[PDB]
Design an enzyme around this catalytic site. Structure first.
Site, short mmCIF file in Angstrom:
data_model
loop_
_atom_site.label_atom_id
_atom_site.label_comp_id
_atom_site.label_asym_id
_atom_site.label_seq_id
_atom_site.Cartn_x
_atom_site.Cartn_y
_atom_site.Cartn_z
N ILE A 146 0.79 -1.22 0.00
CA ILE A 146 0.00 0.00 0.00
C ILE A 146 0.83 1.28 0.00
CG2 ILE A 146 -1.91 -1.14 1.14
CD1 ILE A 146 -1.07 0.03 3.75
N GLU A 182 5.27 3.10 0.07
CA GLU A 182 6.72 2.95 0.11
C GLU A 182 7.38 4.26 0.52
OE1 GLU A 182 8.28 0.23 -2.80
OE2 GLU A 182 9.88 1.65 -3.31
N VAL A 211 9.02 -0.34 2.88
CA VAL A 211 7.77 -0.55 2.16
C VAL A 211 6.68 -0.95 3.15
CG1 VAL A 211 6.59 -1.90 0.42
CG2 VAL A 211 8.99 -1.31 0.11
N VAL A 212 5.46 -0.45 2.94
CA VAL A 212 4.37 -0.79 3.83
C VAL A 212 3.31 -1.64 3.14
CG1 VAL A 212 3.14 1.36 3.36
CG2 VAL A 212 2.66 0.08 5.47
N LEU A 263 -5.21 2.13 9.00
CA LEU A 263 -6.25 3.13 8.71
C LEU A 263 -6.60 2.90 7.25
CD1 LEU A 263 -4.86 4.45 11.35
CD2 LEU A 263 -6.35 6.37 10.67
N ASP A 316 -5.38 7.46 2.89
CA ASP A 316 -4.49 8.56 3.23
C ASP A 316 -5.07 9.85 2.65
OD1 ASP A 316 -3.43 9.04 0.47
OD2 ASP A 316 -2.25 7.24 0.79
N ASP A 376 8.89 14.71 8.04
CA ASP A 376 8.53 14.47 6.65
C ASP A 376 7.04 14.36 6.43
OD1 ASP A 376 9.18 14.13 3.91
OD2 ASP A 376 9.19 11.95 4.12
N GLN A 402 0.51 11.85 1.84
CA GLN A 402 0.61 10.40 1.84
C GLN A 402 0.82 9.77 3.21
OE1 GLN A 402 1.96 8.92 -2.64
NE2 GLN A 402 3.41 8.82 -0.92
C1 LIG Z 1 6.66 3.76 4.46
O1 LIG Z 1 5.74 3.37 5.34
C2 LIG Z 1 4.52 4.02 5.54
C3 LIG Z 1 4.15 5.20 4.77
C4 LIG Z 1 2.86 5.86 4.99
C5 LIG Z 1 1.97 5.32 5.98
C6 LIG Z 1 2.32 4.13 6.76
C7 LIG Z 1 1.35 3.60 7.77
O2 LIG Z 1 1.68 3.50 9.07
C8 LIG Z 1 -0.02 3.19 7.33
S1 LIG Z 1 -0.52 3.26 5.70
C9 LIG Z 1 -2.07 2.66 6.18
N1 LIG Z 1 -3.15 2.41 5.37
C10 LIG Z 1 -3.46 2.94 4.13
C11 LIG Z 1 -2.62 3.93 3.42
C12 LIG Z 1 -3.00 4.44 2.16
C13 LIG Z 1 -4.23 3.98 1.55
S2 LIG Z 1 -4.68 4.57 0.13
N2 LIG Z 1 -3.43 4.95 -0.72
O3 LIG Z 1 -5.54 5.90 0.42
O4 LIG Z 1 -5.59 3.46 -0.65
C14 LIG Z 1 -5.06 3.00 2.23
C15 LIG Z 1 -4.68 2.48 3.50
N3 LIG Z 1 -2.18 2.42 7.50
C16 LIG Z 1 -1.03 2.72 8.15
N4 LIG Z 1 -0.91 2.56 9.48
C17 LIG Z 1 3.61 3.49 6.53
#
Ligand SMILES: COc1cccc(C(=O)c2sc(Nc3ccc(S(N)(=O)=O)cc3)nc2N)c1
EC number: 2.7.11.22
Length: 277
Positions: free
Chosen positions: A10, A12, A17-18, A75, A78, A119, A123
């Site tokens: 989802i 990077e 990478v996440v 969550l 973003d 940062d 996103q």
């Molecule tokens: C490099 O590592 C990272 C970078 C940014 C966030 C995190 C992080 O902790 C996250 S990301 C996430 N869910 C999520 C993010 C984007 C989308 S989308 N694009 O709207 O479909 C859908 C679900 N949940 C958590 N907890 C980790």
């Protein structure tokens, strides 16, 4: 991991990478960041005890086989995605205000605990269906430069909490106008885009700026543009607050705590966003 079943990649960052993943045993759904130092590990520990409703919870830290895994509460979307989804109509002002207010609460909290994000960008600001927004992917002590504070671009070796206020100010402007405030595609372009809008800084507005590591007397001298042209759809309270979040001098830039008391938040509420998941 082995105790996890990756549902999908989802995101990077610049260090890892996440993935969206499920705890094969507990069945809990989480965000798993995979990264391929005593300072870091302890810097991380501090992050684990950093609990606030506007900060993504770090659940577990796993160091194994040349890999570092950070398990976070998941969550569903973003802010970058939400802004794109809201591009035709724009995010309603009340929701923009709620999100800004909440993010300031989160920053006020980390800053009082001497933790800097470093940062912030759309996103890594995460939202849920209940109207909350949380700070994610904290930075430790093609990359986007759009939200980088001028002092970082000018080579300051010691960041202050002010760098987060600057990033958040840029995000606030972006939510309002539906266009990135300073979309630079290089460090110097980023710096010059800031100068063209806010004016090339000098010793008057930013004491010490001409002696900064990367400052060059040869920088062009651009006059400051009328602020009303910067974020037109924003009322005066909003513009006033933004101007304080975008002060050049880190020491003049408003703090998160002070920002929370700004008149702009007099009528703040907590709307529910319409989220398409
Ligand atoms: C490099 O590592 C990272 C970078 C940014 C966030 C995190 C992080 O902790 C996250 S990301 C996430 N869910 C999520 C993010 C984007 C989308 S989308 N694009 O709207 O479909 C859908 C679900 N949940 C958590 N907890 C980790």
């Amino acid at each position: 991991m082995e105790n996890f079943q990756k549902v999908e990649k989802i995101g990077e960052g610049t260090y890892g990478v996440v993935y969206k993943a499920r705890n094969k045993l507990t069945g809990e759904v989480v965000a798993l960041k995979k990264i391929r130092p005593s300072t870091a590990i302890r810097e991380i520990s501090l992050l684990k005890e950093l609990n606030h409703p506007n900060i993504v919870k770090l659940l577990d830290v796993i160091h194994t086989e040349n890999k570092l895994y950070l398990v976070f509460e998941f969550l569903h979307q973003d802010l970058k995605k939400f802004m794109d989804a809201s591009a035709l109509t724009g995010i309603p002002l009340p929701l923009i205000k709620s999100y800004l207010f909440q993010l300031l609460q989160g920053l006020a909290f980390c800053h009082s605990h001497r933790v800097l994000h470093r940062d912030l960008k759309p996103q890594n600001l995460l939202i849920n269906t209940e109207g909350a927004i949380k700070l994610a992917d904290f930075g430790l002590a093609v990359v986007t430069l759009w939200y980088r504070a001028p002092e970082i671009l000018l080579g300051c070796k010691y960041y202050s909490t002010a760098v987060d206020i600057w990033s958040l100010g840029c995000i606030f402007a972006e939510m309002v106008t539906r266009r990135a405030l300073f979309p630079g595609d290089s460090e110097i372009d980023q710096l010059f885009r800031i100068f063209r809008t806010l004016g090339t800084p000098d010793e008057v507005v930013w004491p010490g700026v001409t002696s900064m590591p990367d400052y060059k007397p040869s920088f062009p001298k651009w006059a400051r543009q009328d602020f009303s042209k910067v974020v037109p759809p924003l009322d005066e309270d909003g513009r006033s607050l933004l101007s304080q979040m975008l002060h050049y001098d880190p020491n003049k830039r408003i703090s998160a705590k002070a920002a929370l008391a700004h008149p702009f938040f007099q009528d703040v509420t907590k709307p529910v966003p319409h989220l398409r998941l």
